Amino acid sequence: AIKRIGNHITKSEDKREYRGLELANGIKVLLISDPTTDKSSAALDVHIGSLSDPPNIAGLSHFLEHMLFLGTKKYPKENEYSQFLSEHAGSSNAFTSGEHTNYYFDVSHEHLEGALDRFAQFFLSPLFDESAKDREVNAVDSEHEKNVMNDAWRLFQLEKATGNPKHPFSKFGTGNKYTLETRPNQEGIDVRQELLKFHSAYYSSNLMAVVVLGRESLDDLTNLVVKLFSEVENKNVPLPEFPEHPFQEEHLKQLYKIVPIKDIRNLYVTFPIPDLQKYYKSNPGHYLGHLIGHEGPGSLLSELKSKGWVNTLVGGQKEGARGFMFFIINVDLTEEGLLHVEDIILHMFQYIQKLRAEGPQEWVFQELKDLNAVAFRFKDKERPRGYTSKIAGILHYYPLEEVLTAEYLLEEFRPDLIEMVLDKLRPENVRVAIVSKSFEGKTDRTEEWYGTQYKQEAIPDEVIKKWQNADLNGKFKLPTKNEFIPTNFEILPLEKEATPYPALIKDTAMSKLWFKQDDKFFLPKANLNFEFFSPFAYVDPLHSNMAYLYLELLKDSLNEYAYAAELAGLSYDLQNTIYGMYLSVKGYNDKQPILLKKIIEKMATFEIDEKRFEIIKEAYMRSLNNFRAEQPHQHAMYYLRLLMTEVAWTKDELKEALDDVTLPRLKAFIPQLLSRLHIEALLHGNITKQAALGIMQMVEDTLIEHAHTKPLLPSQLVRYREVQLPDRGWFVYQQRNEVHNNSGIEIYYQTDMQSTSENMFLELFAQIISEPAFNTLRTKEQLGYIVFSGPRRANGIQGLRFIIQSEKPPHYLESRVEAFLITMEKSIEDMTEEAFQKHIQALAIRRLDKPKKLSAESAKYWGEIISQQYNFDRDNTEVAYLKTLTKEDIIKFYKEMLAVDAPRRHKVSVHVLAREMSQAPALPQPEVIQNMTEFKRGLPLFPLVKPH
């Protein structure tokens, strides 16, 4: 079905040449040409989802697109494709939606022909082997098993599940092992003959969406792949649509009271709405999402904050099926926000009435049109993974020139659409869902798969009647026009000062300031990473509690102003560290000194409300004891950063210390905190050197203006040290989770500080323990799913750790860890020069890459500024050291540091018990650890690093 069509594609700043076409067998094709990209890619999306399954077997298309990986007529071996992307660093994956299933992969540089040769003939010959089936059923069951207690997918499926049992929306997407293979054979149904049925009948027809991120040209890749794709044969399967929303009045105007897993409280408002996909030109859904969840003066959220009932919210247009679509409003609840919900709904109806008074607005449409104008015009680049799959997800509805101006460009104003959705948004169309933990003994209708319990209990008419007629206005106003719109579009020419790295352009006894500007990237955006530094931050639980509650109520106050900036592409973040408080602003070049001036002056002189303080106290206090409940890999990493620092406060003691925190103590504390402190900042983007000096001066002068901050002396530039191990010891202890029936472990190894040898040693060892541990332990030995291996780099200290959550005895697990160590030990001496050379070159390309997004490289540089290293030319350092390595060196690495007969043994594991609690030698005995403090009492501390 070899057909070819291309022309100019509206592609914004980008240099990547593009073409789109479509083959006569129903395959959407996008041609990407770029002569400067390393990794080439391609990604096929079938416009068939898991709602198109047969009514008896769930996740059948899901399981087939799993099984469509393995086995061709040309290469019937199992991982052959995948191993071929293990040769050249590729990483395929695929995902499934209600109407789509989307394969995607990449490839090293030019090797596309191979993977495409191993990818095209999936349609001709599926095999359905022994091993594929018998391992993939375990992979699907684990895929569902990690989705058992995940509350997002849980509440997702609960939305999926409380509808029409007749609508094909009512299919179960993933499927566990009970529905996957236990259900057909107990019914006598052959799984494989169905697989052949499903593959033959459904897949082959139409609605594919290929893209090809290639780095050759357009024409040569074109007449390769059109030729290469004629074996897919059209069958004319019609386009699957739904002519009605699944809520045919049995389920409308309804409430639910839901008990979650994590102790959260949410209220959910849902509208099933027909499609406006044909109206992608005018797009009322952006207007609705823009207008509903707005946060300004006279807004709904301003009143709910003003009554203190809702902390934060998100609502808006939810994408759905071809026929129907959704419209959500999801709000947070306080105590009597849990108790006085109806009036909240009344306030929502007042906001609806506000929308009913002014009707649509045009200056809003021009404003949002200009925002998407500029913002679509100024697009940076694309991710070689994820972007292509996303566009290919949206590629179904648009011609080959509309693939970029997808929804990110709007032509026309259609107030009749706004009249339609205004007419749609009525108390008739509301779905309600209450999320609270306290509904025990009260909910009968239990979920079948997951097991949550709920009740219908339809709203009586008195509330309804009062809801329709009483839609009036109180103190609600239209959201004022933005003023943070930019006119700064001027590219600043690079100066005589052509440094490739930020120089210390300003030094005081107060601060230290680093700055660069983008020679490559050329965007009107900038980064800001202010860090407040204070002794008093981590001194105790009590002042740290006050710091967290301070910054919480700080952002909570300044949010209602912040929303217009956040809507414009002006981000900020207040955070706390072990050091002090953490600020990271990022965004455009418009009101940068101005907004920053406001921020600094606001958190400089800041005030507190009473009931606001009560809410921040109670709410984070409720957020405290949730940290018993997380997964033990997360909990174990918390213990890892617990043990491997100098001082560390546990979450219980920190939890208990809020029993006495009153508002006057904090309000006395605050300027004392603000009395002295340090700021050290990295500024990166579209400004100048002298204006940066003025911005810094501005900031510190603003501080001295408010709280009369004076500089620090360089003896209170402290850092935390890290714990020495007694050179031969292997120490461990255990904690116990209540909820999970799984044990976790993290297996720490102190090598050394980052010296030039140790970086390439540990990196090389990390890659050689990367793939075979995934190959033999998690895959082959089937230990668990949360199996993790690899490096640890913290506090200027290298490390090696192994994160494994499973249902095993942990010492049994240790024994096979050590067995894997012996396996690797033997696997060392078996290395040829090909493993050697390909392995170190793949390590080089893993390490070496020039940054694509400016926000990424700033996070790396920032991550080095907080670690006080600053050696930005570590890359040349590492590559120059890398050429000087042997294999016997890594035995020299192995023996004294890693082996069991080690004089220099620095071994340590961490156990985490489960809820209820092939040959290994005799390792030495561990220690019991009752008091971690009395443990750390007599233990040495590491040196710190000479800063580059």
Q: Please check if 62 is assigned to a binding site.
A: yes
| Polymer length of the chain | 948
SS3 29: strand
Q: Please check if 852 is assigned to a binding site.
A: yes
Q: CB neighbours of 221 closer than 8 A, spacing ≥ 6?
A: 31, 33, 112, 212, 214
Tell me the DSSP string of 328-391: EEEEE--HHHHH-HHHHHHHHHHHHHHHHHH---SHHHHHHHHHHHHHHHS-----TTTHHHHH
732 neighbors 926 (Cβ within 8 angstroms): yes
What do you get for the CA distance between the two ends of the chain, in Å? Answer: 61
Please state, in angstroms and rounded to a whole number, the distance separating the CA atoms of residues 464 and 254. 11
Residue 842, both tokens: 């793949």
Q: Is 298 left (phi over 0), alpha (psi -120 to 50) or beta?
A: left
**Which residues face 326 on adjacent strands?**
272, 318
SS3 823: helix
Q: How are beta strands 511-516 and 678-685 bridged, if at all?
A: parallel
Angle between helices 833-847 and 874-882 (to 10 degrees): 180
Q: Please check if 314 is assigned to a binding site.
A: yes
**Which residues face 27 on adjacent strands?**
23, 208
Please state, in angstroms and rounded to a whole number, the distance separating the CA atoms of residues 355 and 292. 9
Please state, in angstroms and rounded to a whole number, the distance separating the CA atoms of residues 666 and 410. 50
**Which residues face 804 on adjacent strands?**
745
Catalytic residue chosen out of the listed positions 13, 17, 22, 65: 65
Per-residue CA distances from 557 to 210, 574, 613, 732, 879 (Å): 48, 12, 11, 45, 49
Q: Please check if 684 is assigned to a binding site.
A: no
Q: Please check if 46 is assigned to a binding site.
A: no
SS3 529: coil
Please state, in angstroms and rounded to a whole number, the distance separating the CA atoms of residues 587 and 858. 13
DSSP state of 238: P
Burial class (CB in 10 A: 0-12, 13-18, 19+), 916: exposed
Please state, in angstroms and rounded to a whole number, the distance separating the CA atoms of residues 257 and 267. 9
**In 3-state terms, the chain is what percent helix, strand and coil (to 5)?**
40, 15, 45
Per-residue CA distances from 113 to 68, 212, 224, 230, 927 (Å): 19, 11, 9, 16, 56
Q: Please check if 317 is assigned to a binding site.
A: yes
Q: Please check if 740 is assigned to a binding site.
A: no
941 neighbors 647 (Cβ within 8 angstroms): no
Residue 9, both tokens: 């594609």
Burial class (CB in 10 A: 0-12, 13-18, 19+), 659: exposed
DSSP state of 715: T
Instruction: Give the distance, in angstroms, between the CA of residue 520 and the centroid of all CA atoms in the same chain.
Output: 27
Which of these, 438, 452, 430, lies nearest to 345 by C-alpha position?
Answer: 430
DSSP state of 947: P
SS3 896: helix
Per-residue CA distances from 841 to 88, 198, 745, 877 (Å): 11, 43, 32, 16
Other CB atoms within a 10 A radius of the CB of residue 372 amount to 16
What is the CA angle 32-400-198, rounded to 5?
A: 90
Q: Which technique was used to obtain these atomic coordinates? A: cryo-EM
Please state, in angstroms and rounded to a whole number, the distance separating the CA atoms of residues 136 and 65. 11
Please state, in angstroms and rounded to a whole number, the distance separating the CA atoms of residues 360 and 337. 31
481 neighbors 567 (Cβ within 8 angstroms): no
**Which residues face 93 on adjacent strands?**
104
Q: Please check if 552 is assigned to a binding site.
A: no
Please state, in angstroms and rounded to a whole number, the distance separating the CA atoms of residues 884 and 875. 15
74 neighbors 121 (Cβ within 8 angstroms): yes
Please state, in angstroms and rounded to a whole number, the distance separating the CA atoms of residues 274 and 271. 10
What is the CA angle 78-83-84, rounded to 5?
A: 115
Please state, in angstroms and rounded to a whole number, the distance separating the CA atoms of residues 30 and 213. 8
Task: Give the number of C-alpha atoms closer than 13 A to the C-alpha of residue 577, restricted to the C-beta side.
Answer: 18
SS3 132: helix
Which of these, 511, 571, 486, lies nearest to 693 by C-alpha position?
Answer: 511
210 neighbors 22 (Cβ within 8 angstroms): no
Which of these, 84, 82, 93, lies nearest to 43 by C-alpha position?
Answer: 93
736 neighbors 915 (Cβ within 8 angstroms): yes
Please state, in angstroms and rounded to a whole number, the distance separating the CA atoms of residues 11 and 19. 10
The resolution, in angstroms to one decimal, equals 7.2
Residue 55 parent element (H or E): none
756 neighbors 681 (Cβ within 8 angstroms): no
Q: How are beta strands 266-274 and 324-332 bridged, if at all?
A: antiparallel
**Which residues face 45 on adjacent strands?**
102, 209
Which of these, 581, 733, 727, lies nearest to 643 by C-alpha position?
Answer: 733
Scanning 99-190, the segments in alpha helix (DSSP H) are 112-120, 130-145, 151-161, 177, 183-185
DSSP state of 775: I
Q: Please check if 316 is assigned to a binding site.
A: yes
90 neighbors 41 (Cβ within 8 angstroms): no
513 neighbors 506 (Cβ within 8 angstroms): yes
Tell me the DSSP string of 166-227: SSGGG--SS--HIIIIIHHHTTT--HHHHHHHHIIIIITSS-EEEEEEESS-SHHHHHHHHH
Instruction: Tell me the backbone φ, ψ of residue 682, rounded to 5 degrees.
Output: -110, 125
SS3 295: coil
729 neighbors 897 (Cβ within 8 angstroms): no
Q: CB neighbours of 121 closer than 8 A, spacing ≥ 6?
A: 72, 73, 74, 231
Q: CB neighbours of 834 closer than 8 A, spacing ≥ 6?
A: none
What is the CA angle 236-73-64, rounded to 5?
A: 55
Instruction: Tell me the backbone φ, ψ of residue 192, rounded to 5 degrees.
Output: -65, -40
Dump strand ranges (E) for 255-304: 257-258, 266-274
Per-residue CA distances from 437 to 331, 442, 452, 652, 773 (Å): 16, 11, 11, 22, 41
Q: CB neighbours of 550 closer than 8 A, spacing ≥ 6?
A: 666, 670
Please state, in angstroms and rounded to a whole number, the distance separating the CA atoms of residues 134 and 78. 12
- 65: annotated active-site residue: yes
Instruction: Tell me the backbone φ, ψ of residue 708, rounded to 5 degrees.
Output: 60, 40
Q: Which amino acid is at 563?
A: Y
Query: Alpha-carbon torsion 343, 349, 355, 357, what sign?
Result: negative
Residue with tokens 């026009």: 481
Instruction: Tell me the backbone φ, ψ of residue 773, rounded to 5 degrees.
Output: -70, -35
Instruction: Tell me the backbone φ, ψ of residue 121, rounded to 5 degrees.
Output: -80, 15
